[PDB]
Amino acid sequence: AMLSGKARAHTNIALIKYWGKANEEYILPMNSSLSLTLDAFYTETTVTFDAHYSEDVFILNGILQNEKQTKKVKEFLNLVRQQADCTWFAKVESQNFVPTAAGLASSASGLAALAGACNVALGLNLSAKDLSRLARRGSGSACRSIFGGFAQWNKGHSDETSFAENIPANNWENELAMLFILINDGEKDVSSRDGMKRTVETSSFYQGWLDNVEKDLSQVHEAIKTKDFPRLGEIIEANGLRMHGTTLGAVPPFTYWSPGSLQAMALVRQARAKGIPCYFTMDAGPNVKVLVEKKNLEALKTFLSEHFSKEQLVPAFAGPGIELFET
Amino acid sequence: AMLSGKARAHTNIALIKYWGKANEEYILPMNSSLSLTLDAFYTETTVTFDAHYSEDVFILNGILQNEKQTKKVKEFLNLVRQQADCTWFAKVESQNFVPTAAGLASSASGLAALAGACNVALGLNLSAKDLSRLARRGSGSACRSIFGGFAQWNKGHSDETSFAENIPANNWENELAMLFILINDGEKDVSSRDGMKRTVETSSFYQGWLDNVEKDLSQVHEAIKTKDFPRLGEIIEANGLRMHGTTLGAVPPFTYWSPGSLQAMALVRQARAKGIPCYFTMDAGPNVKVLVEKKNLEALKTFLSEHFSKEQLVPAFAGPGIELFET
Ligand SMILES: Nc1ncnc2c1ncn2[C@@H]1O[C@H](COP(=O)(O)OP(=O)(O)O)[C@@H](O)[C@H]1O
Ligand SMILES: Nc1ncnc2c1ncn2[C@@H]1O[C@H](COP(=O)(O)OP(=O)(O)O)[C@@H](O)[C@H]1O
Ligand SMILES: C[C@@](O)(CCOP(=O)(O)OP(=O)(O)O)CC(=O)O
Ligand SMILES: C[C@@](O)(CCOP(=O)(O)OP(=O)(O)O)CC(=O)O
Ligand SMILES: [Co+2]
Ligand SMILES: [Co+2]
Ligand SMILES: [Co+2]
Ligand SMILES: [Co+2]
């Protein structure tokens, strides 16, 4: 009386940010978002549901996770057990090939992989669309890691209509790269979930964010259709700066940036000034991601090595959607 | 046929920020502001109007200023010459005891001192209120350096009704201190005037700024009446963060912060956590000012010496209003 399943999902980095939930229970977002799934960082997860288990168990990077660290996995397991009428405790064994809780989207790859493993184990036979909807319930960004390359999370207006899909770009995504500047791989002070809730509920800047996101998304789409790299980069750099601006208007205000974040951002502007087209974005933490055409990646890593070590510059290319495995 | 005059004015640091002009020609602000005039940084300026001069001359720190560097002094001289019907060129000799164009309010002390020197030389016999109105025409923050201690610039609605005045605080200002952390005394990339104009005209966050400034000012006034230091510090720290947030929503966005700015801000929060009540604010540049009660100033300088040198921690106390000199 045992059901098991496995999946691999890659991280994604948001080009147009998701920031703030319209519905906290179902993770319905205030705005639509768009990301690039990457090849460098991924999560591998197996789940086992077994009548003989006596409690839910979460093992991450070979390390048993404590009650606080398991609360959310347990929330996702409860949700999927209701969606199957399954009453069995589960064992979740996951390995993050990506720093955890550091602004490098380990919740995207991690909850996507768990959703996929659960889909397999409980024989749910979900379409990609419906697997995206389930992953959304664990972490918003995870619903986009179901797909490769460019993916859009349509905010919709209900559990049924909020989900992601691939954005065809006539192969453009394979002509691009993202260079991670690792300022700090440690666990961050304010979680993505808590930070965006504080922003929604208290930031005087949040309406400004909302009033600009759809225009940014439209221009990202026009840029894709024309493979206009400077236009893409200007939109996404400003979109990320606008998102981080919102936390300075929260009550109390806060920032995800660290000193090295600003150093890296300024350096990206120097690189542009000195003839390397590239644009930075930051998800919810201190690390800096630099969008750059593949042909300029080595140029950029060398430029940036003047201030960061080899261990701090990690390149990445477009990556695949989720991979399921019956075991 | 020569008229001469001299004045000394001290810098001020805004606790509630002025950010954005409702009228660029007359420097009427979008919101009222409140500052503390300080004893550590000041400007000394002499002006001479003489029928024999052949052009306006501006000498700053013993160095002749070029055309670009004199444009604004020339605008202030033209304005004051119209207000006297004087047709004579002038020589302005000024010494800044304060880094220039670095976010340490050298335009406040400098244009205040020039306004005072011109008042003297042309025998204008201005009330403090009217001298504040004239200094306002050279630099907004300068209209507050006419007064000592706490001073408020009332935005008014016309050249006649926009001016500053002292805020009585039952001696509280003499129980306080401000510690400057000098991250970079160099000349800053974006001027205060250009930065705030870009913000007014393009920032999606500017309305949020406007919608909160009057509430901040009110609470600063209640805190003064009760000498409530924690309440003052929380208001002013959030007000400064909100002001800097507005530039991340500008088009294109920008920041005045440098890496050391964030380091210093984080350290101030550590100091609070470890039992030293103190609060940071930043005017338009990378340097960080820390409001602190006098009794905790040495504690704080020692705490901060773990990461900054002696040359980077400059203390300051409340300072006087403008001093005029007939020569
Ligand atoms: N492999 C995983 N399986 C389950 N939950 C995970 C996994 N990796 C990360 N998480 C969850 O994601 C949280 C981090 O979420 P978030 O604050 O969005 O950070 P990040 O920047 O890593 O995406 C972790 O503390 C944990 O709750
Ligand atoms: N002593 C002075 N006399 C005249 N103008 C001055 C003086 N000191 C500074 N200024 C003017 O102020 C400008 C800096 O203004 P601002 O951008 O507000 O910088 P700050 O942070 O120093 O106040 C200088 O470039 C110059 O135009
Ligand atoms: C700024 C972002 O990186 C925030 C991602 O937040 P999460 O997707 O981690 O949050 P939850 O829905 O609470 O799990 C932008 C993005 O990934 O779209
Ligand atoms: C953020 C501030 O430091 C900006 C001061 O700007 P200025 O008074 O230098 O600007 P102008 O009116 O253009 O001369 C806040 C303040 O001093 O009130
Ligand atoms: Co996340
Ligand atoms: Co993200
Ligand atoms: Co100034
Ligand atoms: Co100022």
CB of B103 shorter than 6 A to ligand 2: yes
Instruction: Name the residue with the closest Cα to ligand 4, atom 8.
Output: B141
A102 Cα–ligand 5 center, Å: 8
d(CA B46, CA B58): 10
Same domain, A127 and A192: no
CB B132: neighbour CB atoms within 10 A? 27
What's the CATH number where A87 sits? 3.30.230.10
- DSSP lists the bridge partners of residue B166 as B151
Angle at A273 between CA A287 and CA A17, to 5 degrees: 35
Contacts of A212 in chain B (CB under 8 A): 204
Backbone angles phi, psi at B245, to 5 degrees: -55, -30
Of B245, B251, B252, the CB nearest to A249: B245
Nearest by CB to A242, which of B234, B244, B249? Answer: B249
* B241: nearest CB among A253, A257, A259: A253
**Beta strands per DSSP E along A52-171:** 57-60, 63-64, 90-97, 150-154, 163-166
Residues B169, B192: one domain? Answer: no
φ, ψ for residue B162, nearest 5 deg? -105, 110
Residue of A183, A204, A244, A258 best to disrupt the B interface, most CBs of B under 10 A: A204
8 Å CB contact of B245 and A248:
yes
Among B148, B181, B214, the domain boundary falls at B181
> Is there a single domain that holds both residue A170 and residue A229?
no
SS3 assignment, position A129: helix
- Mutate: best of A242, A246, A288, A307, partner B, most B CBs <10 A: A242
For ligand 4, atom 14, the nearest C-alpha belongs to: B139
Q: What is the domain count for chain B?
A: 2
**How far is the C-alpha of B166 from the C-alpha of B129, rounded, in Å?**
10
Residue B164 and residue B216 in one domain: no
Q: Tell me, what amino acid is at B102?
A: A
Query: Which protein residue has the closest C-alpha to ligand 3 atom 13?
Result: A193
Closest CA to A113 of A9, A3, A37: A9
Last residue of a domain, one of B161, B181, B201: B181
Same domain, B129 and B223: no
Amino acid letter for position B50: D
Joined tokens for residue A41: 């960082």
At residue A111, the 3 state secondary structure works out as helix
The stretches of A168-279 forming alpha helices (DSSP H) are 192-202, 206-225, 229-247, 259-273
Same structural domain for residues B45 and B151?
Answer: yes
| Approach to solving | X-ray
- A259/B255 CB distance under 8 A: no
| C-alpha distance from residue A151 to each of A186, A216, A224, A280, A327 (Å) | 27, 15, 12, 19, 28
| A35 and A170 assigned to the same domain | yes
Taking residue B118's Cβ as centre, other Cβ atoms within 10 Å add up to: 31
In contact, A88 and A52? CB cutoff 8 Å: no
A187–chain B nearest CA distance, Å: 17
B280 and B155 in a single domain? The answer is no
Please tell me if residue B245 touches chain A, with a CB cutoff of 8 Å.
yes
Same domain for B8 and B132, yes or no, is yes
Chain B interface test: which of A248, A251, A281, A282 (most B C-beta within 10 Å) = A248
- Strand pairing report for A57-60 and A63-64: antiparallel
111-140 of A, contacting B, C-beta below 8 A? none
Pairs across A and B, CB distance < 8 A: 75
SS3 of chain B: the string is CEEEEEEEEEEEEEEECCCCEEECCCCEECCCEEEEEEEEEEEEEEEEEECCCCCCEEEECCEECCHHHHHHHHHHHHHHHHCCCCCCCEEEEEEEECCCCCCCCHHHHHHHHHHHHHHHHCCCCCCHHHHHHHHHHHCHHHHHCCCCCEEEEECCCCCCCCEEEECCCCCHHHHEEEEEECCCCCCCCCCHHHHHHHHHHHCCCHHHHHHHHHHHHHHHHHHHHCCCHHHHHHHHHHHHHHHHHHHCCCCCCCCCCCHHHHHHHHHHHHHHHCCCCEEEECCCCCCEEEEEEHHHHHHHHHHHCCCCCHHHEEEECECCCCEEECC
Pocket lining: A105 vs ligand 1, CB cutoff 6 Å? yes
The answer to whether B145 touches B9, Cβ cutoff 8 Å, is: yes
Q: Is the CB of A114 under 6 A from ligand 1?
A: yes
| A83 Cβ under 8 Å from any chain B Cβ | no
Report the candidate in A75, A111, A260, A238 with the shortest Cα–Cα distance to residue A183: A260
Resolution of this PDB entry, in A?
2.0
Nearest CA in chain B to A213: B204
Q: How far is the CA of B143 from the centre of ligand 2 (A)?
A: 14
> How far is Cα of residue A240 from the mean position of the Cα atoms in its chain?
14
CATH code of A266's domain: 3.30.70.890
B226: Cβ contacts below 8 Å, ≥ 6 apart: none
Domain span including residue A96:
1-181
Exposure letters A79-111 (e unless 16+ CB within 10 A, then b): bbbeebebebbbbbbbbbebbbbbbbbbbbbbb
Q: Are residues B167 and B126 in the same domain?
A: yes
Which one of A132, A150, A181 terminates a domain? A181
Cα end-to-end distance, chain B, whole Å: 15
Strand B57-60 and strand B90-97: pairing? parallel
Strand pairing of B21-23 and B28-29?
A: antiparallel
Which uninterrupted H or E stretch holds A316?
strand A313-316
A32 is in an annotated binding site: no
Return the residue of B nearest to A264 by Cα. B259
- A208: β partners: none
CB nearest to A248's CB, from B204, B244, B252:
B244
Same domain, B78 and B219: no
Residue type (1 letter), A182? L
Under DSSP, the state recorded for A8 is: E
Judge contact between B33 and B17, C-beta under 8 A: yes
Listed residue (A203, A192, A164) closest to A33, CA to CA: A164
Say yes or no: A258 contacts chain B, CB-CB below 8 A.
Answer: yes
Q: Are residues B218 and B113 in the same domain?
A: no
